[PDB]
Write an enzyme that holds these catalytic residues in place. Structure first.
Site, PDB file in Angstrom:
ATOM      1  N   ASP B 325       0.806  -1.233   0.070  1.00 39.11           N
ATOM      2  CA  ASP B 325      -0.128   0.244   0.454  1.00 39.11           C
ATOM      3  C   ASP B 325       1.063   1.084  -0.031  1.00 39.11           C
ATOM      4  O   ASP B 325       0.432   2.193  -0.192  1.00 39.11           O
ATOM      5  CB  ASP B 325      -0.877  -0.149   1.248  1.00 39.11           C
ATOM      6  N   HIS B 446      -9.921  -1.854  -2.849  1.00 37.48           N
ATOM      7  CA  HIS B 446      -9.130  -1.343  -3.681  1.00 37.48           C
ATOM      8  C   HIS B 446      -8.976  -2.422  -4.841  1.00 37.48           C
ATOM      9  O   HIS B 446      -9.459  -3.587  -4.087  1.00 37.48           O
ATOM     10  CB  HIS B 446      -7.760  -2.123  -2.659  1.00 37.48           C
ATOM     11  N   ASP B 448      -7.368  -4.531  -6.337  1.00 36.81           N
ATOM     12  CA  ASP B 448      -6.078  -5.534  -5.468  1.00 36.81           C
ATOM     13  C   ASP B 448      -7.441  -6.944  -5.435  1.00 36.81           C
ATOM     14  O   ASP B 448      -7.028  -7.634  -5.218  1.00 36.81           O
ATOM     15  CB  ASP B 448      -5.285  -5.369  -5.269  1.00 36.81           C
ATOM     16  N   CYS B 620      -1.289  -7.763  -0.706  1.00 39.39           N
ATOM     17  CA  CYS B 620      -1.644  -6.682   0.038  1.00 39.39           C
ATOM     18  C   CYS B 620      -0.217  -6.594   0.883  1.00 39.39           C
ATOM     19  O   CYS B 620      -0.260  -5.080   1.533  1.00 39.39           O
ATOM     20  CB  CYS B 620      -3.207  -6.594   1.329  1.00 39.39           C
TER      21      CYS B 620
END
Ligand SMILES: [Ca+2]
Ligand SMILES: [Ca+2]
Ligand SMILES: [Ca+2]
Ligand SMILES: [Ca+2]
Ligand SMILES: [Ca+2]
Ligand SMILES: [Ca+2]
Ligand SMILES: [Ca+2]
Ligand SMILES: [Ca+2]
Ligand SMILES: [Ca+2]
Ligand SMILES: [Ca+2]
EC number: 3.5.3.15
Lengths: 638, 638
Positions: B325, B446, B448, B620
């Site tokens: 991130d 997000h 992702d 993540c």
């Protein structure tokens, strides 16, 4: 877009289909087992297409639904998919559909009439609505641009705005379970304002970027009025996109779900200048002490060119006689509205209020740029901002001409430039593709001091005029050759030292200074030749001498005749007060001899103790508003 | 450009002619009277052209001189114009010329080699040098980007810079009366820095926009090294123009006079991302409490993918385990140099220093955007910044793919967006033409969390993976059908409530939440289908369930398997801990069954009490640097 509807025999599905959308069917993802094949039946309002009378059940077989008309009620159109196999009795999956119209409409053909890809494209084969910056004062009352507040106060104001219409056709109960929202990116909300017309209340703008619309089921048409609040600029390319989203609000527990989006893209209309070749409409000056006789000559000239006249009295001037320098009158143009707009220089001398107070008004816009206190230079004065007539340059067309402004040849500690903010502003307008010229060699520093353009009946329809010492030397030498070397420049002026042609031609310092000027001008000559695609037959040299004074910068030796007022064919040329030969100033005759064959009428206006000794001439003390091009800027392909 | 040389029999003229310039002659403007005609003779180094063996003296007849080689000394080439008439003995006007070479050179063909129109053009048939932002730290000593100060400290640093060479050929005494100056607009001086190489001293830069060059007569070659200091951005389109001006300084009384200008235009190289389809080179994570076993699985995977590994210990983490991130590793690329560059998110949590302190370095660049204290949102985290593989969309080619990032469906009081500064930055890079997706429905927000891409040996060379509840329902239903309804999701986890397939499939609230998610995802599906030109055969659904928690935002029901680490063919997929059937988690089997036929190796990494309960997975908690595209960004035509 499109939507993928996923069907199952588990139970029936319910979906909405916006007309003009490609709707697609996923059949294989839940086809029950036992099954080879499928068939489709649908109610008569649904059209079914299949590429790649009953078909095998292969996942890359493609099924699409389109709907001919809006639903009268929920689920009124049906689709029935029947799965079957060699020994397997048919099973039906059911799809209930509701069709609707959601048409967000705007003038994208650019004709004054609102009737997938939402992009804006230039040219006459292109597409996209136009939007004007609502920068005039139709509001008779106060002193702000219409667009600075959140309200439509006059109905006249709406003429400036652009019309967007939402056009829906739905079942009567449709907005029971659906809501429409109108919106604009946060990125663009500070640049547009949108009013709902019922009278008018703001729904989108700098403060709000989305708004839930209150829309009845059935056939309904909702009118919006849009104004822009910012011209294209360095940080704004000039597109504004407004979007309609349709939300499913059926489930009271779950969040709203987007079902459909459409947009229109607007392009904010650029500010555009008018060259001297465009027919004049209104003329501007100041009145000051011992001015009267200049102003009558100008008044006479206006009258012959059909022009409204407009003067600024010494109570407002505050001694500032240079009407050219504080402002420039351009226009903005949409299919539904065209209106003049003053570009108001940050020069901010005595005329500081004139553009705000007297020029900005009903159907008269305002804009300004650059720092308002300090940070400025003489090159920011709008005697240093001009525009060419239309030209084609090596095949590329500049149907509105090309802005010209003066600059130094390279940046140094002593050099001046027009402020970056203005340069940036002018380039961002795109359609006049500014060209930088070399004017920093002049004391005052303005391109109007060495060039002008005038209409001409042949060739490309104009002549570029340039100041030319070469030409003044040739003329004076010619006069000496035919016996007139004795003649007196400044003849007819009191408290000024007459000089004979012979002593002028023999003055070597003067001949040097003028040679340096000759170079400065010639540099621009080739520069204009290149960037405007000019040839020598487009250019006329005007006999003109200079001298170098302070910082070796150049001033006019006698009144700068190229710094003239152009009212169609009626020229308002400074009075050279040349050496008088056979009853007439040979300068005046030389000029007349060059311009009269093009239809031009030369009036020699005396500005000597009024303007010339203050380092400026007729052009410098006046200003014109002129007819916008007929060519529509959006048809250009910059 | 060109120059107009004005000749006279009054006396001889002297001029300079820069090789490669069109030089022109004005003959008629001072031809003496008595005269019909003219002839031209010239020394053997001068080539004379006449369109429109002796010619009549007509003002639109055209005469041009070009010069084959540099002069050895002043005035060494001559031109002689002879005017004559029926009864008029010939008279000669003389022109003495000095030829010179002034070649400002740069890598405009984009091949590593420096050997009229100075414009920059994209594509493989285009032209214009490339310039890199010198945003790495080759300086081993301190913590700033190389380009923040005014000096070249290492010689390594020069490898990053672009070479410009001034190449002159003049008479030995030429810079007696002429000076050359190098310059850049004030507009661009804060974005470029230029060093003279003799060792190296700055000559142009933020503080100075022009510099008098010290150049000997004869043949001389002067080397300059250029660095950019700013990436293309909203207020900078990315071109920088450097100009050489030649000044005549012959007259000690008059100001300098410009004789010649030439330029090169550089384009500052954009920052470019790497999709998961690009071979991996280095992998990043944190180490924290009770983490060890996650990190071995990752270590094993790196090793199989040939990757350098890199970890961040809890002294620097400051509890921040989310390596995805805070940063994104891209590259910048010139013909002479390519180097990775970290885009460092303004997220600014515990990892705040990691990009500065540990990633930025020798041949490792840095960039950052947006406000560093406050003004931010979860959508600014770089788990919300991805890029597609290369794709062609309806004929337009995106050879570097397209950046993807998450957004809301429309702006509201509760909506989030990635900060405007980042969005603006990403679009300004041009070559990856960002697309906005809908991710605001996820708790964390997000992209992702619902997508990934993986290499594939056929088709277009990848698969888009998407999370899919539909698919997890179908799988679980299938298992119930073959008797396994009793099976237990979360089997093998302590302090967690097992749930049977039967009770999951019967849970109507869960089925509702997942239907809403299904819509949010499907919206993006069509969105990606359109903007990336994808077809269904490009897409694979990964069985995945969600639930809605706070603000009805969506979290993963079990470990989000699409939030995986992609090291070429070696996938690092979160461990679903599915219902175990016939020895194996049916989720794992379903995944394997979808990915193994594409050559992919699926490793299921346990992240449950480490990351999953903290609302994130493997993807993540990690990050990768990957091989730059081989395709050269400047060959694109955006
Ligand atoms: Ca208003
Ligand atoms: Ca108005
Ligand atoms: Ca002003
Ligand atoms: Ca109006
Ligand atoms: Ca002007
Ligand atoms: Ca440095
Ligand atoms: Ca470096
Ligand atoms: Ca940071
Ligand atoms: Ca380096
Ligand atoms: Ca990322």
């Amino acid at each position: 877009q499109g939507t993928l509807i996923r069907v199952t025999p588990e139970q029936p599905t319910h979906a909405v289909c916006v007309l003009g959308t490609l709707t697609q069917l996923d059949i294989c993802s839940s086809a029950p087992e036992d099954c080879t094949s499928f068939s489709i039946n649908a109610s008569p309002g649904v059209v079914v297409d299949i590429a790649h009378s009953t078909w095998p059940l292969d996942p890359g077989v493609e099924v699409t639904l389109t709907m001919k008309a809006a639903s009268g009620s929920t689920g009124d159109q049906k689709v029935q998919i029947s799965y079957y196999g060699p020994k397997t009795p048919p099973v039906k999956a059911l799809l209930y559909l509701t069709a609707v119209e959601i048409s967000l409409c705007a003038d994208i053909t650019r004709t004054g009439k609102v009737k997938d890809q939402r992009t804006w494209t230039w040219g006459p084969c292109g597409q996209g609505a136009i939007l004007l910056v609502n920068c005039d004062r139709d509001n008779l009352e106060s002193s702000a641009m219409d667009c600075e507040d959140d309200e439509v106060l006059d109905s006249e104001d709406l003429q400036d705005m652009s019309l967007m219409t939402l056009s829906t056709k739905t079942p009567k109960d449709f907005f029971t379970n659906h809501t429409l929202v109108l919106h604009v990116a946060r990125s663009e909300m500070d640049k547009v304002r949108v009013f709902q017309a019922t009278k008018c209340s703001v729904v989108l703008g700098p403060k709000w970027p989305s708004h839930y619309l209150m829309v009845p089921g059935g056939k309904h048409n909702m009118d919006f009025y849009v104004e822009a609040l910012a011209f294209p600029d360095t940080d704004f390319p000039g597109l504004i996109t407004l979007t309609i989203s349709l939300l499913d609000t059926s489930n009271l527990e779950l969040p709203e779900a987007v079902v459909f989006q459409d947009s229109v893209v607007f392009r904010v209309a650029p500010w555009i200048m008018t060259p001297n070749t465009q027919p004049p409409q209104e003329v501007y000056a100041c009145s000051i002490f011992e001015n009267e006789d200049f102003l009558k000559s100008v008044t006479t000239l206006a009258m012959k060119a059909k022009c409204k006249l407009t003067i600024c009295p010494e109570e407002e001037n505050m001694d500032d006689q240079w009407m050219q320098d504080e402002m420039e009158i351009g226009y903005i143009q949409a299919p539904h509205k065209t209106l003049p707009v003053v570009f108001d220089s940050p020069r901010n001398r005595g005329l500081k209020e004139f553009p705000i107070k007297r020029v900005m008004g009903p159907d008269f816009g305002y804009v300004t740029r650059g720092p308002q206190t300090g940070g400025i230079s003489g090159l920011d004065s709008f005697g240093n901002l001009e525009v060419s007539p239309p030209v084609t340059v090596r095949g590329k067309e500049y149907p509105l001409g090309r802005i010209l402004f003066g600059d130094s040849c390279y940046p140094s500690n002593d050099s001046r430039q027009m402020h970056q903010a203005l340069q940036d502003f002018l380039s961002a307008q795109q359609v006049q593709a500014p060209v930088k010229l070399y004017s920093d060699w002049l004391s005052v520093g303005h391109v109007d001091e060495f060039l002008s353009f005038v209409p001409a009946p042949d060739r490309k329809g104009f002549r570029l005029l340039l100041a030319s010492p070469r030409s003044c030397y040739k003329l004076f030498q010619e006069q000496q050759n035919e016996g007139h070397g004795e003649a007196l420049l400044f003849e007819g002026i009191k408290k000024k030292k007459q000089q004979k042609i012979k002593n002028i031609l023999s003055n070597k310092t003067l001949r040097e200074h003028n040679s340096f000027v000759e170079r400065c001008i010639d540099w621009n000559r080739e520069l204009l030749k290149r960037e405007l695609g000019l040839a020598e037959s487009d250019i006329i040299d005007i006999p003109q001498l200079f001298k170098l004074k302070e910082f070796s910068k150049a001033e006019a030796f006698f009144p700068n005749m190229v710094n003239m007022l152009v009212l169609g064919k009626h020229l308002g040329i400074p009075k050279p007060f040349g050496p008088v030969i056979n009853g007439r100033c040979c300068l005046e005759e030389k000029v007349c001899s060059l311009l009269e064959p093009l239809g031009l009428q030369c009036t020699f206006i005396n500005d000597f103790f009024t303007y010339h000794i203050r380092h400026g001439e007729v052009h410098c003390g006046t200003n014109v508003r002129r007819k916008p091009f007929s060519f529509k800027w959006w048809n250009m392909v910059p």
